[PDB]
Amino acid sequence: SMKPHLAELRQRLAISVLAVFVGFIIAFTFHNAILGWITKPLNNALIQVGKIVEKRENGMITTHQVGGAFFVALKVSFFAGILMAMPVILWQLWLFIAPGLYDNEKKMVLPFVVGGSVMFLIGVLFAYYVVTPFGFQFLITFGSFLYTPLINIEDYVGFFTKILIGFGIAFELPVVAYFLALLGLITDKTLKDYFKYAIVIIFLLAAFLTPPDVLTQLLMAAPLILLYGLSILIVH
Amino acid sequence: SMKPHLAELRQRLAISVLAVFVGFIIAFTFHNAILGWITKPLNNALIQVGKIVEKRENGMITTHQVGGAFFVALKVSFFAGILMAMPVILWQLWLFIAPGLYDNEKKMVLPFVVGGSVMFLIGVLFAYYVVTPFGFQFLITFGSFLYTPLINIEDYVGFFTKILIGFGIAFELPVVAYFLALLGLITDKTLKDYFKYAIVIIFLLAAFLTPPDVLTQLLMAAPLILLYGLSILIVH
């Protein structure tokens, strides 16, 4: 079947794996700094909540698994290496489809991917420096008068990367909408008509991006529906 | 196919969803009181165990997730709204099957559902006010001499809801057995002969209501087997 078009795929995957490996090595070397950067918002929120509680009248970052610290360090290093391998993962992926983009879409793809990457980066930066500091406090001040916030690093790391990745994508969808709309391929009528259909697929996507709880599915579908409405407004 | 019998289904689902939404709104308004009611037995058990330990010679309710308090409040509100929308849920469900119960079962269904609901509420009340206060202590005093009880609200809410719901059902099965037996449809012979087959389905049902561990599957199948024996005795 597709036997001749496999050697290039093998080489691309080999270079991708090597890139992920070197990124992992560098990230594990810098794991102290990376973990400090990840945990700074949580520490600041805990200190602020403690000050508020003391003014009204403890908190710390814990680990609930014996290998929890090592597992968290390894996971953060792996994620950073994958992120540090993004330029080379694109180097492998784009070079794979060489004849697909003959002369025109070959020129159109580069600004699109550049804009998507820069907007994902700006979304992650906005999530870390704006949304999280004013949100984590609100998440901790809610239970500050009923419970004690013993936050484990194992769950916190996953929660933090989930928020960062989602907010990065949340700033990418209304840029791919802009690219597609200004390209002229899709008009406002197409998205306005296919509104009910979106209703289900978004609700399906939330079913796959959340734990099995129905409440999580609703809490993920609502922002996605808001983003769909935002794209509806954006297309002109 | 079943196209004409779909508009009524759509209307029933829509009004049920609206009822669930209004219940969620009310429950999130009263979430402080609801969470206090849920967490009162745990606090009492912690205080009693602490007094016992001090007399022999700490404990608190914690949250292990940054959004754990908000998620717990939302989950409790959603559960309360679903419970608060149960009367209108049955309003929609019963009205759906209008012609199925022509003249006799139409009048026989109402006492059955009324009795089932009242026994479910009495079972929840019995579990909250009798079983839990004398059980939670035993679940905490068992490990009070080896470990420290830092109970997270995220798992406690699920555990308490599961116990309450199961005990409500545990007081409903030997009422549906009573209804079926007094109706005359099922005698003692039917349940006595079909004993071995039950051994399967219960173990299957207990397999679907538990985490993947085998031990908890057995620990759920045993009370169901006891309930089956109780129903066997009840048939008269």
């Binding site: 009910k196 209703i199 399906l204 079913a207 099995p212 129905v214 599915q217 | 759509r10």
Partner: peptide, 16 residues
């Protein structure tokens, strides 16, 4: 998924 596809079915019935 898991028990959430029920809600997907529900949204199809609610939105045709």
């Amino acid at each position: 998924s898991g028990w959430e596809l029920l809600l997907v079915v529900g949204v199809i019935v609610l939105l045709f």
